[PDB]
Design a protein around this ligand. Sequence first.
Ligand code: FES
Ligand SMILES: [K+]
Ligand SMILES: [K+]
Ligand SMILES: [K+]
Ligand SMILES: [K+]
Ligand SMILES: [K+]
Ligand SMILES: [K+]
Ligand SMILES: [K+]
Ligand SMILES: [Mg+2]
Ligand SMILES: [Mg+2]
Ligand SMILES: [Mg+2]
Ligand SMILES: [Mg+2]
Ligand SMILES: [Mg+2]
Ligand SMILES: [Mg+2]
Ligand SMILES: [Mg+2]
Ligand SMILES: [Mg+2]
Ligand SMILES: [Mg+2]
Ligand SMILES: [Mg+2]
Ligand SMILES: [Mg+2]
Ligand SMILES: [Mg+2]
Ligand SMILES: [Mg+2]
Ligand SMILES: [Mg+2]
Ligand SMILES: [Mg+2]
Ligand SMILES: [Mg+2]
Ligand SMILES: [Mg+2]
Ligand SMILES: [Mg+2]
Lengths: 108, 136, 72, 170
Amino acid sequence: ATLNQMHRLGPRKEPPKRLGPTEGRPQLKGVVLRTFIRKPKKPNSANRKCCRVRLSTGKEAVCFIPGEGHTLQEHHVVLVEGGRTQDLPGVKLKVVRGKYDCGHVQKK
Amino acid sequence: AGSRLETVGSVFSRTRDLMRAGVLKEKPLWYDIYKAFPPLREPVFRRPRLRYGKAKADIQDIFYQEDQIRAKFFATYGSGQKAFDLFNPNFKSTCQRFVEKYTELQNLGETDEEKLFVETGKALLAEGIILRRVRE
Amino acid sequence: KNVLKIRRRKMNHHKYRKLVKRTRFLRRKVREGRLKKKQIKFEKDLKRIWLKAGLKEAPENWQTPKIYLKNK
Amino acid sequence: PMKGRFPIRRTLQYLGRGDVVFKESVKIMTVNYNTYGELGEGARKFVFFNIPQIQYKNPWVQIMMFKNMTPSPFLRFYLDSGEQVLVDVETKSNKEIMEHIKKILGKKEETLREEELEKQQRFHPGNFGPRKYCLRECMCEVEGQVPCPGLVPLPKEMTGKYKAALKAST
RNA sequence: UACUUAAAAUUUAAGGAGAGGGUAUCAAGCACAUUAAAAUAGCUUAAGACACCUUGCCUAGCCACACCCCCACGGGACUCAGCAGUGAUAAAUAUUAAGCAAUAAACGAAAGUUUGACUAAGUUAUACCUCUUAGGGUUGGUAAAUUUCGUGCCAGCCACCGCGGUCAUACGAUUAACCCAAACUAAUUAUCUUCGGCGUAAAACGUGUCAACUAUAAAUAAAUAAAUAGAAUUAAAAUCCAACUUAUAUGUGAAAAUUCAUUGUUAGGACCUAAACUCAAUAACGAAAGUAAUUCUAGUCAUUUAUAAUACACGACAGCUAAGACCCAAACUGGGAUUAGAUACCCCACUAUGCUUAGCCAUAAACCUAAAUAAUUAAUUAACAAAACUAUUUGCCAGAGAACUACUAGCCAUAGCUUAAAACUCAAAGGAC
Ligand code: FES
Ligand SMILES: [K+]
Ligand SMILES: [K+]
Ligand SMILES: [K+]
Ligand SMILES: [K+]
Ligand SMILES: [K+]
Ligand SMILES: [K+]
Ligand SMILES: [K+]
Ligand SMILES: [Mg+2]
Ligand SMILES: [Mg+2]
Ligand SMILES: [Mg+2]
Ligand SMILES: [Mg+2]
Ligand SMILES: [Mg+2]
Ligand SMILES: [Mg+2]
Ligand SMILES: [Mg+2]
Ligand SMILES: [Mg+2]
Ligand SMILES: [Mg+2]
Ligand SMILES: [Mg+2]
Ligand SMILES: [Mg+2]
Ligand SMILES: [Mg+2]
Ligand SMILES: [Mg+2]
Ligand SMILES: [Mg+2]
Ligand SMILES: [Mg+2]
Ligand SMILES: [Mg+2]
Ligand SMILES: [Mg+2]
Ligand SMILES: [Mg+2]
């Protein structure tokens, strides 16, 4: 672009930073609604443990539960955090182990 | 260990550099000779490029003043029936004798080209040279 | 130079043309209603002007032109 | 590569090299120059190289330039009194034009220095406060003075916590 | 605070050199002007008006707000956005504390009095500082550092690339190392922001003309090869009609259907529909699209040069509207073959349509995939294409797909064109060799 064209337009317009599943917040608190299994998109093979939750904002999201074995059930309370599960498409939230009803993984 | 880079610098500069580096401990025998009696131009690599646009070479067409007279003689009489001998360094052709006489008359002060061309033909005719005015 | 990018656009346009053909009658009714709402919005915007200016009736001999109807 | 011809003209150092600071009377400087010709070459160079420097040092002066309106280039200054100073810059180098206008309508070096000193009259080295305005924020920074309690803990007897305990003890 | 008249601090009102968030799919606002007999018809705006959305900024500090109704006569859902504290809510968690001793403010002539300002404390790894203890994470690559076993595409793991189906340095447990350390790791947020590009990768607009700026500096142009429009004209080959005439004609790789209302000849007649061989191995004209059978008429030409849209005029083919034309070609359709099928490729027939005259439509791989203009050819090989490269002006581009899409506005367009997003998905997509 010419110097006249750079002057008439100025600095590049910056698209706004749209928020993610946590809505620009470190964590959210949600109530478990259902516990189910999700299948990782190929080339991976597993039965990943997930749960649906109703977040404090009022929306409902799918959250991956990390660790080997959880005791979560419906009506439990959990603290979710950000971070996508790479193989699980659409799962953009995770549960925090050791907060509210969710507990630390039982060591073997 | 050497400098096989013939596109940067020259054989002399690369040999100068190798000795400064410390890799070449003995001067080549041709080195001091080049230092004392170098070439006119440094032998450095240059990539030939084509000329583009309106760039042109600088070569003068070699045309002496005798050629104006010689062109007329070949158009009027062609090449002399006597054959050119280009091995004799002092050969005098029929056309060269015409141009020598044509010059002599012009020194006298004749200003008309037509006068100098028809008078020269008469002079050579007296000399006995066989000039054929071959239009063909 | 392959034509792969042209083939993606080729399929999108082919499928889109068949979608419009299937729902041609529905799309016609959407348009006639979108134009009607477009006309009402035009009339209301003209009524806002004279009412704000303080007139209680539209200027004498004025009838809002119907500009979106099948006049041509 | 910086765009345009002579990109050095678009540097703060070049703009600050201008030496013509007009007197307060000068309000407008109209520049009439011709884009084609031989006697106007210095004028064209003056608009190219010098007009930016003049505007940088005289932000409140209106410089308006007109092209190819007259046979010869000239400069006309409009003063606040209503006087009009016409300058003829034909056959004159751009440097010569700058020197001419500096002499007739330029502030002297003495005047400019005096204004600079007056501007800084209210800054005092002894004054304490924020870094933007002062050298030192607190007297604790000075050598020999009691240091800041955050950096160096104060003696117990100089602390309100300790003094309060004694008053209760008394 | 001074004088009978002047120095400040602090404000208020009317303004304007310049600067000042986002969306142009917000493009028009609709009285937003001037004059001063009261007329004139103006004012703002692509150099961004107006509309909408978001946000405290100018930081020794400033601005706005003070239960709500912008305001607060009034009305109402009737007061901690003063200190501490509570309910609810939230990922978010300080004392319902002491003193007016210091400074500040208020009052008083004053000794003085008052103050949840403030001072000194309480609370909290949020930060810094001094000490003392040691914990936290990591160990496939990027990136410092793994022993053994268990598991066997399961259980699990990853910021990216990826790991796990029997010897897993990548999972879990151990072992040893590595990093940081009173912290350590996770999530969230913020800090880095245009002098780069546009033949083939995103990107030069289908074409030209007129403005205002920014640049440039010359004084010409045109001067019968196919621009364009109108009228007239016609050689070849078809078609129709007629005479004569084979028995078949037509068609394919081979067949079938079709046909004998055919076929072949005509130095016979009519027709002027449609299209213009050779020339053309040419490279002209025109802004582009486009234009080449012949003749005649009208006609291209000077702005220094580049640079234009929201205006104007054009714009292959296909398509639409009305009235005509019709030799041949031909979507569709019907008939015949082929094939597992053949809604096709091949055969035959015949429409819309290609033609004229009016109007619309405004799209092309509208592509030399090269914006225009003026220089230079050396002080220059990413690859390929079409050698490199400077300057000027405008346009355009900012990972891929979603998307020649949704919505918006304009349009003779109505299954349309131009304008043109986001969610969401992916870690690539793409160009050359
Ligand atoms: S900053 Fe000076 S005493 Fe703390
Ligand atoms: K795998
Ligand atoms: K208020
Ligand atoms: K006090
Ligand atoms: K093993
Ligand atoms: K491990
Ligand atoms: K381990
Ligand atoms: K092309
Ligand atoms: Mg598609
Ligand atoms: Mg929209
Ligand atoms: Mg109020
Ligand atoms: Mg309140
Ligand atoms: Mg109050
Ligand atoms: Mg409070
Ligand atoms: Mg906190
Ligand atoms: Mg007092
Ligand atoms: Mg792990
Ligand atoms: Mg790892
Ligand atoms: Mg492209
Ligand atoms: Mg069929
Ligand atoms: Mg037909
Ligand atoms: Mg187009
Ligand atoms: Mg073309
Ligand atoms: Mg299209
Ligand atoms: Mg569309
Ligand atoms: Mg649309």
